[PDB]
Amino acid sequence: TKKESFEDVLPSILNTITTNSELTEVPEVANWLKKVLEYNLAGGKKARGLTTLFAYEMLEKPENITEETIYLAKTLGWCVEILQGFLVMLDDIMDGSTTRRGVPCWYQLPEVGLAAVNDSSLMFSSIFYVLHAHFADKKIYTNLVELFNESLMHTSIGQHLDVTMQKSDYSLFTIERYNAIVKYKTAYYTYQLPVCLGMLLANISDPVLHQKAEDMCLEIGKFFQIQDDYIDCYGDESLTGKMGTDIQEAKCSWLAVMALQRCSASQKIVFTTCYGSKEPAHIERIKELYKQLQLPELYAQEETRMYESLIKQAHGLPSELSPALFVRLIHMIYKRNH
Amino acid sequence: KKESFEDVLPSILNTITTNSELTEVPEVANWLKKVLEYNLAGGKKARGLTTLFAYEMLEKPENITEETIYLAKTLGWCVEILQGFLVMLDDIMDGSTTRRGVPCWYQLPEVGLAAVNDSSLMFSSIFYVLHAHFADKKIYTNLVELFNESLMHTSIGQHLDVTMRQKSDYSLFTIERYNAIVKYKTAYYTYQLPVCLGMLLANISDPVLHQKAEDMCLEIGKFFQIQDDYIDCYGDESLTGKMGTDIQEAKCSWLAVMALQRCSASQKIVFTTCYGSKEPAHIERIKELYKQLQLPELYAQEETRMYESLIKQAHGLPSELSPALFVRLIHMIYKRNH
Ligand SMILES: C[n+]1ccccc1CC(P(=O)(O)O)P(=O)(O)O
Ligand SMILES: C[n+]1ccccc1CC(P(=O)(O)O)P(=O)(O)O
Ligand SMILES: C=C(C)CCOP(=O)(O)OP(=O)(O)O
Ligand SMILES: C=C(C)CCOP(=O)(O)OP(=O)(O)O
Ligand SMILES: [Mg+2]
Ligand SMILES: [Mg+2]
Ligand SMILES: [Mg+2]
Ligand SMILES: [Mg+2]
Ligand SMILES: [Mg+2]
Ligand SMILES: [Mg+2]
């Protein structure tokens, strides 16, 4: 498949990183970074990486594709996956997670701890070395750099809106707020960024076509993140790799937004009493409540209603952008369970 | 002047807002204004100033305009923001309580570990500022690369510093390790970065000049950080703004390296029992020892010997690099007590 052609290049990227920086003079560190990247890139569906590649392939004229440019698309893809490793390494710190992708969270390991913040800084550094190494003499260098940087700003905005903190006043848990959280923290780097890289590599220029792409990208990313929210509560931990914590940490997830939309007055009491606590009596009661408000069934309807809506918006796009591309991206996620 | 450097800060903060997606999320735009104002306030502004001085003294005098000076101040403020990012992450890892006379950001009650996200914000800001003022100049890509290289070098240094002895084994507390730690964790971004920024702004691009600058900059940084280590122990918290933690955190600081050169066989046993403990009497026993071994006296001599040595080198530089500039920079930190 396409996944095995993408995982092939990992050791080569690991090597590019070392050889193209001051890590060569300090191999104690160049070896520590190899262990960090291998652990924090392992497991995982590699979806953002693939998306970048698939996008290049689907968008470039097949006669202009070279083996060189395919390698570059895999490299860009891997930058995005490093980005992802960086973000979830910090995210697990802010969310007091204990596992991810089947194993303990990087910071949980005993030899690491809060030293993880610096491992993240190493990872995020790597990306610009790789970019610099391949791309310094090409006209698109600036655009690539700018894009990875925007994607950090957006992701940081989102993360702030999410982790921003009164006990039992759940009146910021609105749909207006959830839509902003999920635009900035997930949509931009998960879909806008891969596709936009695919577009740059394919030398697509039109600022009107970028906009049309952004609009569709962000719709899909909201979709994606509503599924993630569902999975936190209802996913199977062996399949998903992670223990679900949105309830205990009192996050504004889609499920809580929807619970509040549906609650009677007494149920709202139950919710503002038991949501956000780590006691397991309290977490069971909140899942019993999600069960009565019939949210697993709403989810199913909404997954399908958005699915149809996206497919329809995808078929509305100019062909220079490839409807097929978006259709497939949507199918990759539709009905997923991890 | 410093107060003429501080006069430009409101137009920077302003450029960070208007120039990004923050124009759409005024909640987050404001939060970032608080993060920047709190974490840029207090402190010597020295790396910012070094940027300005380096430009003004490497440039040919009649090219210096009301505009290029604003540009040099803009670049200084980018370095100051970088400083803010690094101290904010260092303070988490080092377990500090206060910086610049006030609580460390992560210590503030509402922030906690979500400080890692604010650091990402601050880091992303740097590049909106660069884009706004340099997008359409030939030095843009270099400016961007400098910043990203500076993150790498610093993180490498931070890695060698946070990587934890294995009980009472101080066999790694050597000067070879100390040298490696300080060259990477401090010298690159404290002196090598600002001076290089001034060089870029004054079209100096001979890479034998960039090399000679760099060899002098790393020596000055080594020195600067030795003073830092002395201050952790012996500085006045009201002059300095921060509490000392090197002893408690069992840091490879210049003082421990030197104490291990001087310990007798029984004193090495006192030092190994008590170094690296939060117990107030253990911390006192190590300072009692630092006094027995006469380290304050050692410092004073060494500070001066190293000072002489740096001055010899500054005078050995070629005219286009301005020995005056380096001489100036040295005199600005020689005998500093915060
Ligand atoms: C969705 N997301 C976006 C940016 C960074 C990290 C994540 C992780 C997810 P996850 O922890 O469920 O994998 P979130 O904690 O729900 O937000
Ligand atoms: C020296 N240094 C370099 C990079 C970032 C932060 C610092 C902070 C100092 P400081 O915490 O004493 O101000 P260090 O922890 O002793 O190394
Ligand atoms: C944005 C989110 C939900 C973070 C995890 O994304 P994935 O669930 O794609 O994580 P991996 O497949 O890369 O583990
Ligand atoms: C590299 C170190 C020692 C970090 C603190 O640097 P300064 O001593 O320059 O602190 P501020 O002037 O920015 O407060
Ligand atoms: Mg989260
Ligand atoms: Mg999480
Ligand atoms: Mg989640
Ligand atoms: Mg430190
Ligand atoms: Mg410190
Ligand atoms: Mg110190």
From TrEMBL, chain B:
Mg(2+) 4 binds at residues 228, 232, 246. Mg(2+) 1 binds at residues 90, 94. Keywords: Magnesium, Metal-binding, Transferase. InterPro entries: FPS1-like, Isoprenoid_synthase_dom_sf, Polyprenyl_synt, Polyprenyl_synt_CS. Pathway: Pheromone biosynthesis. Belongs to the FPP/GGPP synthase family. This is Farnesyl pyrophosphate synthase.
